[PDB]
């Protein structure tokens, strides 16, 4: 076997995740399609009669018919289905990756939109704060046995704020708070995550890094998805990687009496990952007010009715799924983590950064591999090693 | 029976609830009757071992150690205990009622939103809030719980409209056209057992009395201000989270548990009613609306995590965990609180919400100036 070790091109990485995920419910949709078609979800009437063990008792339960009571909400309406056009998106990405150079001038730049972000390791530190905050609102704790699962969350958070070349992520050039990606994979192995589960979360991260980079590097991609709400939602869940994060969270939280097999649990996991992404839009509306009142109508209002339509049906499906005791809370967690997390309060307060207070810095310290930090980042989290 | 005790004074109302509730964990404390004592609670380390049926999976779970991650939160601190002198609070109120008067500001609106001029319009916003709370607790809008939701409205309105206890009991005060007796009769028709109804009724009596005493007796609040742990107990009674909880559990429980009896479940119910009050204050201060505000915030988080941990192992955790922590998601979503931060105004009631609220109005018993409230709900 001639040892060939040239770093995969972005096109070859795209092809790798195609071969792994395969098509979703539309042919030619690999790798950017889920197996579940949310446009086909139905809402069952609630008889109000529930056993003590019913899944409706988990998470946050907001009936569809009650949503007009809340001014930031309203009623629901079925979205139009543009999902069959996903093959045209994949074809376009195939074209773009054939000609794309192996590196870009803007690779590694800050894209958080906040003018005070100038050091990528500082941005990574704020992402670790955010990552642990999500973990806790999902239901997890800060016990040390889940260290590398929480590092994974940080890897999932940072490509939103930093343009990360998928090749530098792959080959070890990019480091999150001093950790290479392979350091994270090796850590998950140490934490006992099964090889099959690691590869699933690994491929989900490959797909996130690729789709995050594509929307920054290919100016045509987002305008292609815009307005096609069913396709845009699918793409947003991929760039958020709520599915990969969920896989490792279930591993950390599961009753010790088996492994998380996508084959068996793909449906509940995809449904729960879609629900949490929709809660972001539902909850962000209150933020500006919590600091800005406006009448929203027309197509803007229609998009919100469609997102609420998807959310309530996702949540009802989770009631009867085997892991409702974990997934209902994951699905609705944004209804309480958005109003509490610095990440979102910072945006409303003039796009500044909240200082990392002493208590938070001490929590974050152990997630930093200082030995592998650049010289210019030697001084990050100064109040943390106290 | 000869019709005796046809009318009740405010003093006899106090004696009635005193005889009904009995003492709490201190002698002579009736009707301040909670047996749970927040000051003595202990937080246990999380083992991390939780079965799928574990109660930690219900509600919102925010570990104490994680709270410094959120700038609007922080660390915790134990509160000082003054609870063992609730008996002197009761003796103080007994003394006041020997000479209690009718207040001059009866009927006035106290909503904090200057645009409120019609008490029945204020009641309609309170009904909006009441269904919003009910939904975030986990409830639905099915018609068989109508009068339980009216009960929530009665519990919400005395903060926004000054209501005398006597006018409340004799039907002079009407909530959206309903007398209090209408609600009691309605709960009977809904199948709530007579013992459950009387419990909810006595909790409402206690709420109306405790909230009235705060305004009528100028010495009561200064007396409580120096006794924070007792002021918390008192605020829980003026919020009537326990009476609302009893009726919510009745609507939400599996019909294989029989009636939800407070004699049976008083411990978990008291814990949950305290959790909800603490969460509400903890969330209102944090997200933007007490000798040391900063210190009290640390004590509220201290109480919150200990109450929630106790709820993990309670028989009705599948209802009470969410009840205890619901404020973490209803405070940022409900018009009631968004209206306050947004210049203390009122958000219009859109046609969709008006149609929900329409059936809750007894239009036949409204005054003339209020005949046409909720116009877009028909
Ligand atoms: Mg750019
Ligand atoms: Zn579709
Ligand atoms: Zn005490």
From Swiss-Prot, chain B:
Cofactor: Mg(2+)
Practical applications: Xenovulene A is a natural product exhibiting little structural resemblance with classical benzodiazepines yet is able to displace high-affinity ligand binding to the benzodiazepine site of the gamma-aminobutyrate A (GABAA) receptor and could be potentially used as an anti-depressant with reduced addictive properties.
EC class name: lyase
Induction: Expression is significantly up-regulated under xenovulene A producing condition.
UniProt pathway annotation: Secondary metabolite biosynthesis; terpenoid biosynthesis
GO terms under biological process: terpenoid biosynthetic process
Catalytic activity: (2E,6E)-farnesyl diphosphate = alpha-humulene + diphosphate
Keyword terms: Lyase, Magnesium
Domain of life: Eukaryota
GO molecular function, one term: alpha-humulene synthase activity
EC annotation from Swiss-Prot or TrEMBL: 4.2.3.104
Purpose of the protein: Alpha-humulene synthase; part of the gene cluster that mediates the biosynthesis of xenovulene A, an unusual meroterpenoid that has potent inhibitory effects on the human gamma-aminobutyrate A (GABAA) benzodiazepine receptor. The first step of xenovulene A biosynthesis is the biosynthesis of 3-methylorcinaldehyde performed by the non-reducing polyketide synthase aspks1. The salicylate hydroxylase asL1 then catalyzes the oxidative dearomatization of 3-methylorcinaldehyde to yield a dearomatized hydroxycyclohexadione.
Homology family: Belongs to the terpene synthase family. Alpha-humulene synthase eupE subfamily.
UniProt protein name: Alpha-humulene synthase asR6
Species: Sarocladium schorii
Taxonomic lineage: Eukaryota, Fungi, Dikarya, Ascomycota, Pezizomycotina
Gene that encodes it: asR6
